[PDB]
Amino acid sequence: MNPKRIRALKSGKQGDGPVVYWMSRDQRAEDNWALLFSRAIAKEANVPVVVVFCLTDEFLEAGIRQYEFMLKGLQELEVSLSRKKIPSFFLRGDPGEKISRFVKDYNAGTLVTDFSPLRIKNQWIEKVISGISIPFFEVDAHNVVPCWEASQKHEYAAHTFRPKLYALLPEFLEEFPELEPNSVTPETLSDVLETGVKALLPERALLKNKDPLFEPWHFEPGEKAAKKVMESFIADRLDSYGALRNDPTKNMLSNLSPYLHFGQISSQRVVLEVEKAESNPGSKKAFLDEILIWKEISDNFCYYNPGYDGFESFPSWAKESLNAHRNDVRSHIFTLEEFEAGKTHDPLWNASQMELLSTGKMHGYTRMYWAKKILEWSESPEKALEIAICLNDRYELDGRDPNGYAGIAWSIGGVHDRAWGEREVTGKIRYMSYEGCKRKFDVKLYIEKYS
Ligand SMILES: *Nc1ncnc2c1ncn2[C@@H]1O[C@H](COP(=O)(O)OP(=O)(O)OC[C@@H](O)[C@@H](O)[C@@H](O)Cn2c3nc(=O)[nH]c(=O)c-3nc3cc(C)c(C)cc32)[C@@H](O)[C@H]1O
């Protein structure tokens, strides 16, 4: 129980009621430093621990696909927490009102939340701070090394973040203690889902035949389903991961991102299990570079760059290059709706958008190709960022995520990249040509599957 995982958000006066874990990013009962820390605080105070989750007003900015995935997982989570004699309360509203009122109504003694570097979570925290007088902590339960510990600043390249992160892995990569149950026991989610689906339905993604686009059987939600996906990745896909991770015709990725995004599985758990696996060397190195270095540098990016979703956060070499080509004539301009419908003149791009539309998880390789063409076929880099973020957040199961803003910023603005050869329109941003993908994998097979 390393105290470097927890820090104070606001001092206060400790009450004598239960310890409240405001769960947000880490929707799981196992392998959860925020829940474990909350339980430990409760034990020292001779009080029970309680979990609260905010069903916020912002769900209408995404789709049924993410709402159902999240809420079905929370239904499973209710059962698991109740087995530990830990009650869970699901508050309909936004956190500033709901958390403050709950703290008062339930005589909470201490408030704890998990860590997200996203603007909306920081918006939420500000309102909560103004409505409570009890101590308020946050625990990094999402990263192996706490984000504010891995580095003191924005890291401009993987190769400057990687040695700092790896220097800290011996301390922070460790097993989880078991969650001790509470000593004694202190509108349903199905109805909430019903109400939300009703409100979301007019905006549901449909084919011209009015049949829905989304296929919900590619990733079953919840902690138990996530563990099976991790186990099948290690048993069946990890050996080939190094060779096949850049081939979107092969189903050889871990497929863990939807579970990692909602915190239905701990990435620390995944890393421990992968470290212990005997697998092809090269493959384990490649996978750990993604789930450790690239995932946690995305939290580094959002945490230390307030404007992480804007042009101003790009590196200076990229801002200069993009500005110098701002007035170049674009080969094409597509509207947000033309991008959304997969109606560019590039069949590889359109197939990547159809994979996103139908499965809610675009292959990692084509996400890079996809975002870079939005830069190439939009009026400005600012508009490209707007369009890519809109589509990523609306349709990825793993979207609205530091990985997303960081991966889009890499794609369009060269964040965590270097300058490449100068081209018109896109400047020195790394280019990914259609013909280059053809030399890389079977583009025709990918197009057939998603068309
Ligand atoms: N590139 C990258 N950046 C951050 N974190 C990453 C990245 N690649 C992998 N990971 C993290 O590692 C695990 C395991 O990786 P894989 O098994 O290789 O991948 P999957 O879980 O099956 O597939 C998800 C993966 O394709 C994406 O994580 C990346 O493409 C990154 N990425 C997002 N990741 C998100 O979680 N949410 C988003 O909204 C993302 N949006 C984008 C947008 C764009 C334009 C790009 C280029 C990437 C991207 C992964 O689960 C992850 O934790």
Q: Is 66 in the pocket of ligand 1 (CB under 6 A)?
A: no
Q: Would the annotation count 251 as a binding residue?
A: no
Distance CA 250, CA 30 (A): 31
CA 255 to centroid of ligand 1, rounded, Å: 9
Give the residue among 58, 51, 119 at the shortest CA–CA distance from 92: 58
Q: Is 350 in the pocket of ligand 1 (CB under 6 A)?
A: no
**Which tokens is 382 given?**
């600012």
- Cross-strand partners of 89: 52
* Substitution candidate for ligand 1 out of 398, 408, 415 with most atoms within 8 A of CB: 398
What resolution in angstroms, rounded to 1 decimal?
2.0
Q: Is 368 in the pocket of ligand 1 (CB under 6 A)?
A: yes
CA 117 to centroid of ligand 1, rounded, Å: 17
Place of tokens 């430990």: 40
CA 39 to centroid of ligand 1, rounded, Å: 31
Domain ranges in the chain?
1-141, 142-310, 311-451
Distance linking the first and last C-alpha atoms of the chain:
50
Place of tokens 């090269």: 282
Query: Following DSSP, what letter does each residue of 313-327 receive, concatenated?
Result: GS-HHHHHHHHHTTT
Walk across the sheet containing 6-10 and list its strands: 6-10, 136-139, 110-114, 19-23, 49-55, 88-92
Distance CA 85, CA 306 (A): 39
Q: Would the annotation count 290 as a binding residue?
A: yes
Q: Would the annotation count 255 as a binding residue?
A: yes
CATH number of 1-141: 3.40.50.620
Ligand 1, atom 3, residue with closest C-alpha: 294
For residue 244, the Cα-to-chain-centroid distance in whole angstroms is 23
Q: Is 298 in the pocket of ligand 1 (CB under 6 A)?
A: yes
Instruction: Name the structure determination technique.
Output: X-ray
Ligand 1, atom 4, residue with closest C-alpha: 295
**Which tokens is 196 given?**
């939300």
CATH architecture of 142-310: Alpha Horseshoe (1.25)
Range 311-451 has CATH code 2.70.98.40: no
